[PDB]
Subunit: 219 residues, 4 copies
Amino acid sequence: SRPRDCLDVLLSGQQDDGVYSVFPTHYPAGFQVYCDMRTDGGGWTVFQRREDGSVNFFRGWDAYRDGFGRLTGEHWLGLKRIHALTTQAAYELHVDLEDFENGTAYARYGSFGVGLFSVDPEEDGYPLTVADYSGTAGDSLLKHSGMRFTTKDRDSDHSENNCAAFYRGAWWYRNCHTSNLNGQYLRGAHASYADGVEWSSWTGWQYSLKFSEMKIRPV
Amino acid sequence: SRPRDCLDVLLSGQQDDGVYSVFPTHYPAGFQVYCDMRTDGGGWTVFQRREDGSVNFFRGWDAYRDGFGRLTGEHWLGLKRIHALTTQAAYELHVDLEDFENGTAYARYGSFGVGLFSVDPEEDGYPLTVADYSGTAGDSLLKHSGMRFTTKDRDSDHSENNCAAFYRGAWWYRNCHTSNLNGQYLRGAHASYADGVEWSSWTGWQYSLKFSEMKIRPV
Amino acid sequence: SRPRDCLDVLLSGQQDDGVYSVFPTHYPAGFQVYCDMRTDGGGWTVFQRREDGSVNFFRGWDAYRDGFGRLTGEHWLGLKRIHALTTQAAYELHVDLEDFENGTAYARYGSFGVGLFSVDPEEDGYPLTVADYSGTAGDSLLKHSGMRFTTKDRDSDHSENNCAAFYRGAWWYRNCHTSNLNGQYLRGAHASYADGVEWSSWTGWQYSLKFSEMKIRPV
Amino acid sequence: SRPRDCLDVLLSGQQDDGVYSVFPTHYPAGFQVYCDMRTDGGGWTVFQRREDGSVNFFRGWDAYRDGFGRLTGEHWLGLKRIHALTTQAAYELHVDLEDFENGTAYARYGSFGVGLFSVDPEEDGYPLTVADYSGTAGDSLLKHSGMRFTTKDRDSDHSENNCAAFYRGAWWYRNCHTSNLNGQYLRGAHASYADGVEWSSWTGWQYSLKFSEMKIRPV
Ligand SMILES: *[C@@H]1O[C@H](CO)[C@@H](O[C@@H]2O[C@H](CO)[C@@H](O[C@@H]3O[C@H](CO)[C@@H](O)[C@H](O)[C@@H]3O)[C@H](O)[C@H]2NC(C)=O)[C@H](O)[C@H]1NC(C)=O
Ligand SMILES: *[C@@H]1O[C@H](CO)[C@@H](O[C@@H]2O[C@H](CO)[C@@H](O[C@@H]3O[C@H](CO)[C@@H](O)[C@H](O)[C@@H]3O)[C@H](O)[C@H]2NC(C)=O)[C@H](O)[C@H]1NC(C)=O
Ligand SMILES: *[C@@H]1O[C@H](CO)[C@@H](O[C@@H]2O[C@H](CO)[C@@H](O[C@@H]3O[C@H](CO)[C@@H](O)[C@H](O)[C@@H]3O)[C@H](O)[C@H]2NC(C)=O)[C@H](O)[C@H]1NC(C)=O
Ligand SMILES: *[C@@H]1O[C@H](CO)[C@@H](O[C@@H]2O[C@H](CO)[C@@H](O[C@@H]3O[C@H](CO)[C@@H](O)[C@H](O)[C@@H]3O)[C@H](O)[C@H]2NC(C)=O)[C@H](O)[C@H]1NC(C)=O
Ligand SMILES: [Ca+2]
Ligand SMILES: [Ca+2]
Ligand SMILES: [Ca+2]
Ligand SMILES: [Ca+2]
């Protein structure tokens, strides 16, 4: 009837990967998401996908709040939706990564949230909660814990510059990053420093990954 | 109680053409629509009507998003409502056309949607999904499949010009159109090229139709 | 539980005049109104009251859309709320009037609505539907039937001037009015022409009434 | 299921202080609040907390309407939420205060509301209803009864100046205050006049308190 996320969709008997309606506690109008019904038993709600560089990710605050791209392709679900999902239960984060040489890796985080205790999550800059790493990609997100989301037109980072402008992305930048999954789709090894789709613990600071998917499931 | 569209209204025992409240999955406040309870068994939700040139259709983005005119007359329901309806099930499209010489024709499309997988349908320009033509008017819409909606103040077409400005309408313009049902009410044969209420496969590019109705029903 | 108007409040067993929560079909968040539980059996939802000139009624479009003043005093409920109420059933209108010499009169209208078939009632200027006069005040509203709402900053009237600016009010002005109940609180006989709280059929065009209340009930 | 406030949360069997979802009558999307389940039996909804000066309270109208800070720390819930809560039942107010010398005091008000009868509470400046003082801190709020909320960018006070600008806060200022709990975190005795976290009846006009919490419970 009114699944709150992709795990409710799965447990209701929908086993196919694809687009489903979900209805978070404080977003009763609901919205559509892509559900991953396969990874570690399934029930993952996707909020980010890179796969081909068809979508511009070098977007401003309003786009990162409201979301962009298409659920069946490259997209960002929007921080207002990611907030609505991660405040309604205790979520884990799964990050799937792929390079241009057939290689894959993943990072699992036991706890993940955006603006968890923010009275106005947008005003407060949708700050990251993330803890408890495991997997094959190595940890490139724990150092971003407690940071606000920074875009090219809204600087909340710990740099004298705008990290989002400098590294051509949008992220919970500190000074500046170990991960940049909303970075430019530069397609593998690049001369420019850390401004591609980067997961530094796996492929370093000068390798733009082929594929990324960020997704959440209640624990 | 809470019909999601005009087919739910019909199946609940309301047989009369007219204005009814509907409540789409992701638009729970609901809104009023005109229901066609006669065409091919009935249960059609109208989203566009031309009949007399009493309403200005040469409107900008905000008007095409939010809707304009009156449900009992010439109107555009608004792309935010057309999105809310066509994302909640698989809809077919019916187009009824009438010329100034008593003549009528129709086009049926087995699949129709607006912004079906768009995270932000407005940002993404409410792109058209349409397939599977049958009827008497001929096909003037399949070539618009995959195109974003373009208005005089928001150009997303495949022309070096603004198709909406050039052809005095608002449509899923490519370069530029085979149909222009939101074009100027020029009343039959006109010297100006393709800037009237055009359905090119029936009446060509220099004939502004007397009547158009665009309406949807779940399959 | 969820009364749609003051008649539902009354029929649920609440007999006292006062402020109650109501929940119109297409305004599910609901809002508070003043309920008149006495007039002709009771169940009237108030949307306008003048009684002492304590509130400024010479307000612009946004104020007339959103409402102003206090439910326990002088107020305007707001055209977005009056639209939400009058589109959900067939309403009658009751107008209670009082002069500064103890005198009272009323006008009853068998049908009343605002933006009844408007796709975007705000865009369409919340046009008046009113018919079927009876009472003691005489008819000062039927000539306003079919007119859009005009304010000092949004002219939709049939005058070469702005009727709202000229007659220091906000109304369904034609060219210009037989009633001006949102006019200046000028307190009885005044030299200035038709710019007070006027009901021309009762007290003419140069008498600003002491009290007005406009209220609706389903028939 | 859908508790309307922290008293519903408590009565449903949740006994722990912390963050909970509540769903006021006219705010059906709901929001998260901090619940005090200990004070005088518990069931208090917090809307203001000062404790360490980590959050800037010298904010404009939009911030005071929408809220700021974090539920687990210093915050302001937002006047739109405080209005949604206090209009749905008859609430009492509890104010807990603490100085920098281990000392504590409280004020209880038998009746408390914001914009209780306002058609547009924001337009009307979220005016204060407060009565019926008891406790140890003395009364520093009854003189603010009937006053609109004033910020540095929106003056509705009875001063020829902007009280909010002058006393570096945001409050139901008259000319100007006996309390200033949204004032600057100046940390105890200060030379500047009345521009700290002031409760004049307890610690006078030149002592910025260490801790304040403002919270409500239905009577
Ligand atoms: C390396 O990456 C691929 C995915 O890109 C992993 O799975 C293999 O994918 C390929 C091509 O996507 C499949 O082979 C081809 O299948 C298609 C039909 O789907 C067929 O038309 C071609 O003729 C070709 O046979 C393949 O089925 C699939 N699995 C295997 C075992 O090759 C692959 O597992 C990744 N890792 C490694 C170590 O290869
Ligand atoms: C041609 O168009 C008309 C609709 O415009 C189709 O139906 C016919 O419509 C006319 C006028 O709208 C009707 O005739 C008139 O009826 C009115 C009362 O409704 C009466 O006052 C007049 O004296 C006149 O008789 C007519 O009933 C209606 N049907 C027919 C059979 O004429 C018509 O079917 C369309 N197609 C063709 C091939 O005529
Ligand atoms: C004329 O207007 C009044 C309302 O303004 C109508 O009712 C009468 O109202 C007056 C004063 O509002 C009442 O008289 C007074 O009552 C108060 C207590 O409420 C008392 O303190 C005073 O000493 C005084 O007696 C009165 O009860 C009320 N009814 C009558 C019969 O006078 C009145 O009906 C209107 N019409 C006419 C033709 O008088
Ligand atoms: C004065 O203020 C304190 C709260 O700040 C009131 O309670 C007392 O708080 C202190 C420190 O917060 C507690 O003492 C310490 O406890 C911690 C562990 O929580 C321990 O690590 C330290 O070694 C130390 O013992 C204390 O338990 C607590 N209660 C008492 C009876 O001291 C206090 O009631 C306030 N009023 C007065 C008159 O002292
Ligand atoms: Ca910076
Ligand atoms: Ca173009
Ligand atoms: Ca005019
Ligand atoms: Ca002032």
